[PDB]
Amino acid sequence: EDKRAKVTSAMQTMLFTMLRKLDNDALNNIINNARDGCVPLNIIPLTTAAKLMVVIPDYNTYKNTCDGTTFTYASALWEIQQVVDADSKIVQLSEISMDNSPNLAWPLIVTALRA
Amino acid sequence: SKMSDVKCTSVVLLSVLQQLRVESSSKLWAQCVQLHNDILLAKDTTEAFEKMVSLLSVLLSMQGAVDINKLCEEMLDNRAT
Numbered sequence: 001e002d003k004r005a006k007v008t009s010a011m012q013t014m015l016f017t018m019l020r021k022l023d024n025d026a027l028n029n030i031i032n033n034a035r036d037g038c039v040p041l042n043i044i045p046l047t048t049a050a051k052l053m054v055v056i057p058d059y060n061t062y063k064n065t066c067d068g069t070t071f072t073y074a075s076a077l078w079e080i081q082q083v084v085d086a087d088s089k090i091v092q093l094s095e096i097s098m099d100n101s102p103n104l105a106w107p108l109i110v111t112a113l114r115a
Numbered sequence: 116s117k118m119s120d121v122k123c124t125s126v127v128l129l130s131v132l133q134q135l136r137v138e139s140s141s142k143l144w145a146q147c148v149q150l151h152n153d154i155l156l157a158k159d160t161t162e163a164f165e166k167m168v169s170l171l172s173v174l175l176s177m178q179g180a181v182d183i184n185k186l187c188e189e190m191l192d193n194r195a196t
Contacts, residue, residue: 004134007134008131008134008135011127011130011131011134012131012181012186013186013189013190014127015124015127015128015131016183016186016187016190018120018123018124018127019124019171021120022117022120022121022124024121024164026164026165026168027164027167027168027171030168030171030172030175031171031175031183034175034183035183035184035187039175039176040172040175040176041176042172042176043146043169043172043173043176044168044169044172045169046165046166046169074168074172075168
């Protein structure tokens with residue numbers, strides 16, 4: 001297992017180098033985002049009414065990515081359908097707030113749709 | 116162009132998912148494969164890059180699998196290589 005791990009290690013290392021060098025806004029979005037703990041729960045869908053799900057750990061992340069009902073992700077625009085807290089319980093856009101953010105159950109989950 | 120490169124990266128991405136044992140989820144792999152065939156076939160860089168963002172998302176959606184932060188750790192300790 002040890003030797004094959006380092007294979008997979010080299011292969012994964014080398015992949016993000018292929019990725020970095022490609023330097024493309026949409027990927028870099030989702031790689032950088034992923035680094036903050038902001039990851040997709042399912043396949044990013046290409047279409048328009050297929051649903052997207054992602055985790056938002058931070059109120060920062062929320063601020064950087066959400067703004068009213070729009071969700072900026074993967075170099076395209078998304079329509080925040082619903083948000084739920086860690087407890088699987090619904091959160092209204094207006095509780096994800098200045099002042100209230102520290103009373104919420106991070107991380108949250110945005111189900112958005114493509115524009 | 117770099118349409119050459121997005122296609123190479125995509126071949127390597129599939130192979131990474133491979134080595135993290137995705138074929139034992141006959142449907143995630145189905146999606147991956149198709150996402151992979153789609154872009155090798157792409158005739159303009161856009162479609163390609165778009166199907167490539169979806170393919171990568173599968174990686175990034177896998178929990179234990181890759182920790183990018185730990186990856187980027189070694190990325191910077193071996194800046195030569």
